[PDB]
Symmetry: D2
Amino acid sequence: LPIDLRGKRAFIAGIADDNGYGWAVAKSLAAAGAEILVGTWVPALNIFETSLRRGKFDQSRVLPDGSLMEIKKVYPLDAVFDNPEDVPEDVKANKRYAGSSNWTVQEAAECVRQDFGSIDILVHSLANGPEVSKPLLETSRKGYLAAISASSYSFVSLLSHFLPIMNPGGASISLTYIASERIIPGYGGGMSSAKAALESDTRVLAFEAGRKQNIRVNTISAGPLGSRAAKAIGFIDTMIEYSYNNAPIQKTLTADEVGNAAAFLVSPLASAITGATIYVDNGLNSMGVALDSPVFK
Amino acid sequence: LPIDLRGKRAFIAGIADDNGYGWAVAKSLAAAGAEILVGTWVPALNIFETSLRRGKFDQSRVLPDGSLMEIKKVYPLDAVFDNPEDVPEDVKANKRYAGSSNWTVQEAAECVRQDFGSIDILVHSLANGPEVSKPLLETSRKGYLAAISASSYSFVSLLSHFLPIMNPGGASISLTYIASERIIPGYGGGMSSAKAALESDTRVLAFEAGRKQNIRVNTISAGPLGSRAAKAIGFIDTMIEYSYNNAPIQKTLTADEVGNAAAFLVSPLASAITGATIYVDNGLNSMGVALDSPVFK
Amino acid sequence: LPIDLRGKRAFIAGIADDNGYGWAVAKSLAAAGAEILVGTWVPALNIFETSLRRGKFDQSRVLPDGSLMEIKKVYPLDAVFDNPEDVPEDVKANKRYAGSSNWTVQEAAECVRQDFGSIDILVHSLANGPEVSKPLLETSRKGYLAAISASSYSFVSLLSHFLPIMNPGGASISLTYIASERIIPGYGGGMSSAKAALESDTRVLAFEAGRKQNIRVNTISAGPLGSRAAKAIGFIDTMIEYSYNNAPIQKTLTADEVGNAAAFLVSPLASAITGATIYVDNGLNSMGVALDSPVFK
Amino acid sequence: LPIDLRGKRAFIAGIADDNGYGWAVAKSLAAAGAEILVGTWVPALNIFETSLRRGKFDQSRVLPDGSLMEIKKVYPLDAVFDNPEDVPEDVKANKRYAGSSNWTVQEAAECVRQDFGSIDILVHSLANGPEVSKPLLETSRKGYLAAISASSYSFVSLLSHFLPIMNPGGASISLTYIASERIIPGYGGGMSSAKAALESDTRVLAFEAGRKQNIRVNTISAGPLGSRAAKAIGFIDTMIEYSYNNAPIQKTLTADEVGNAAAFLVSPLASAITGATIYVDNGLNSMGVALDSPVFK
Ligand SMILES: NC(=O)c1ccc[n+]([C@@H]2O[C@H](COP(=O)([O-])OP(=O)(O)OC[C@H]3O[C@@H](n4cnc5c(N)ncnc54)[C@H](O)[C@@H]3O)[C@@H](O)[C@H]2O)c1
Ligand SMILES: NC(=O)c1ccc[n+]([C@@H]2O[C@H](COP(=O)([O-])OP(=O)(O)OC[C@H]3O[C@@H](n4cnc5c(N)ncnc54)[C@H](O)[C@@H]3O)[C@@H](O)[C@H]2O)c1
Ligand SMILES: NC(=O)c1ccc[n+]([C@@H]2O[C@H](COP(=O)([O-])OP(=O)(O)OC[C@H]3O[C@@H](n4cnc5c(N)ncnc54)[C@H](O)[C@@H]3O)[C@@H](O)[C@H]2O)c1
Ligand SMILES: NC(=O)c1ccc[n+]([C@@H]2O[C@H](COP(=O)([O-])OP(=O)(O)OC[C@H]3O[C@@H](n4cnc5c(N)ncnc54)[C@H](O)[C@@H]3O)[C@@H](O)[C@H]2O)c1
């Protein structure tokens, strides 16, 4: 009873290294036999392809079977720009953006088409929020819109641009965070807002794309990725700790854990699931209180 | 813009003293001019009516206007028994149950009818759970069913028995607790389960009774009632503390607070609200983490 | 048991006429004795103040007591612009925007301050979405961002700009729609998304502002406003019909209905409610199926 | 990337034939290599084992690999009775119950232990509700309690009785229905209530058992199982039709579909998922309106 993505190909948007959720899903899709195409942020591209050439990610490419993951092709990409006319002359003039081409959503999509003709899976693992450090109360309109644009609308833009080249019976999947439904102080600059929009769109799109092309649309609401810090300082480190303490099952969360769920979800096994927000967070979201609250001892 | 329940009468099930949510709603309904009828648990009846005669609740009956609340009539009542044939000879033989009569749901309802002919508001403020101290894992089938019977089904039984005598455009309201949707360790013996059922039934009944008699059906999901203990020991004391610390608005919760919401809800002002779970818990339910978790300092 | 907003003042953002939810809440706040300040979209301002001068809204200003609603002051306002430096020379050059002044969020707020010094209630009744007619799949990035900006971020901008002048123990309230949580085909152009963000922000802000200034933050998730069309054509007309048929309580929805809930919510009676999404939609949101589905007869 | 339950054994409670969800999950678990133990209702036992002997289920036992499913052992079982002292002399005297032995939850569990020593997976596929045809308004207290007992508490009883013999890192899974969260007229007699309780308990137990033995606890909220009737008459037939029409993805639902999700969930791949209600209903739960409502054409 395997997850079989043999003869299927995925496009994974949001891979810059071996340390995020994105890398993890790729691994999983690859373990299940899918053909892997990557979309890399174009400021990040170089270092990415360079370390990959050099073998830097070799240990991070080991599959269960022991073989090594293959990335059939790396595509540069800035998901805040749909078409080329949209780019600010000042962006197209930046060294980084100067070094590559065909990096708009519309362009990436045209390439894939020209290169492979089709796809079966779409993975969104993107996000970005300039003022993510500030509270809403202190978030600028521009910093807020930026988070929404890169973190929400990007999914919409990708889905619509790739849809014409998705074989029906295909699936897409995106990564969300519970700061959409509940107050998680620290996750500011409109990221929370952006995660809320993403989720809702997940539903709508499941309708739009389900009816339109028989495509499944789902999002996975993950936990803080990683193991404990010797000194939990900063937001993520903190959440990791908090979650380790307060969750129904006491353990840490691994990328592998999120990737397997993803692979499952984009797989045929999951033919009856769409417009879902799946929690893969060690059951944290379900708790009413924190176990570690000082009142309880 | 007043809440006007002048010329309306409420039946409040679950009043044994001046210290619970039930007393609070009565006060509120009474401030708004409703005619107050009480249903008192029949083990509790005596002490109740006795202290009330004696003036023991006088300070607790003060209305805003300064006058004193009036209870038009106290009806004894055991909401685990619908009809008289249902009572175990061993219950009917107990001193307490021996002292009163017409205490089944079916009987109480017949009385009211014979005494007043009609009602407009129905308040459920009942609950009871023998093994509420044990974890589900350790809850007996009998202790579990008991919680459901007294805490869930009782609402269903009251609604159905009173419905024929409720003027259309009337409303009912019940008290719930968030341990239905989220894990709140400590609230065991099937109370959690019982609160879950109640809520769902709230919805269904809103459908059944809305369509049947133009009756609104809602539940209020409250916080731990009361102010701080010098030594928070025990479940409630603990929750009060926890909530005071961790809530979006830092303050305590008062019965008045729950009563006003109730009065509002059963009032005509609320003509577009039904099949709702209203949170009156200082916004606790909305939080993702506890502020007091030691990881955060 | 009245809703008393005597000696309180509200600022209502999003009044252009007597036909929306906004007008309704004002009425309600006014019935409860609050002092009414309006923020009018500045393209709409003129016609507004003109018809109001002329008596056009006289029948729509009748309060329950029989008297007539008073608007202490109308302030022009475009909630997509925070500070004056933000305005495009091409907007400031448009006849309409040319006729008025002090219309940025930052400016409106400064005025109020200079005119009244303070406020107690904040009402957001704003929304706008250029491509609201298109499906997400066909919504432009710009049309999507526009909906979010005018429909989501505007609340954030108002709250933050007015906060310094809100007496603690005050409240704000905004209008939402269930297309945030569930698929409602027809409500496109990112409005759905925008309603999702608003809700989430409602929660966060309740935290930010609750802790910061003892301000309550809530949103009301309303139904389609209005009575039946002889020919339900178009989105709203359709929803009205659908809701009339399928709701747990069969009736239409009136603005009065939404206004009363609002008044209640911003009132002191509601001191224990924050980070809530209150449904005032005749219980529609709670249903699992449509009664009118042809399968059921 | 397989779902590997090689060297694992499951106990499936609620198998009486090849036509329910229960049969389906067994198949799935079996495809993934788990060792299958069945708990059969003891009125149903005989016909079950008889047709199975005879080959009646042969076509229904075909695995993907082509081989045939094996049931290592069938255990009789009535999940409304925990211990033998609990049985009414009038039940133990009924032909059916007379023919078998060790059929209480406590007894079944002792047997398994004595026969296999341990288990890894626990599947609950049980339900039963005498007055399921009546509306709550017309449901008896006894008919209501019966639904809860057989449909809710049974899970609690099984979990607790099997827990001592579950290898840590194991999982349990139960089948729920959306009539718990939303009004689905027709699903009466307290089934709705019972499904609500089950879900909540799913959460709590995930806490209790997660912390206690490192066991994952989840429930799957399924759609109406089956394909279209030529004449949709009756509740299920109706729901199937309705769902086919109104769902985001237009298709029917197959048992296979629910089984695969289950297998996944009880599998190690799912190590970060617990206290979840997974929807496997073709995305129906996410919709706001019915597409087939006559208002929309
Ligand atoms: N990391 C966590 O603990 C956690 C928890 C919940 C959800 N998530 C979500 O997971 C996703 C990513 O996972 P992660 O945080 O592990 O990885 P990450 O931090 O690498 O994710 C951001 C990625 O997006 C890329 N990116 C940013 N802006 C871009 C733009 N304009 N165009 C194209 N690419 C751009 C970055 O280069 C990077 O690859 C996001 O959706 C994030 O919200 C993460
Ligand atoms: N107290 C809290 O902090 C809190 C929080 C959330 C919800 N609630 C709910 O509020 C309601 C009651 O409020 P409370 O706890 O303040 O008051 P309470 O403790 O007085 O409530 C129980 C009441 O039910 C009566 N009662 C018990 N069994 C009965 C039976 N078989 N027949 C008739 N009457 C019976 C008791 O005598 C008593 O009046 C319950 O629904 C409870 O779950 C309370
Ligand atoms: N009308 C309904 O059936 C319904 C249902 C649910 C929610 N709502 C919500 O109610 C609110 C408004 O109610 P309504 O639709 O009855 O009234 P409406 O249509 O008058 O609301 C829009 C208002 O915002 C103003 N406006 C638009 N863009 C603006 C900008 N940039 N700056 C300042 N003002 C601007 C308009 O002039 C108008 O007063 C919105 O939040 C809407 O989503 C309405
Ligand atoms: N069938 C559907 O469309 C659907 C939709 C959602 C959820 N479900 C749920 O799936 C589960 C079962 O699936 P199904 O309906 O396909 O199969 P089913 O109808 O065979 O389920 C009931 C099973 O429980 C057994 N049973 C009843 N009372 C018992 C008792 N006291 N002791 C022991 N066993 C007893 C029956 O013999 C039978 O095997 C239930 O949880 C049901 O609510 C089904």
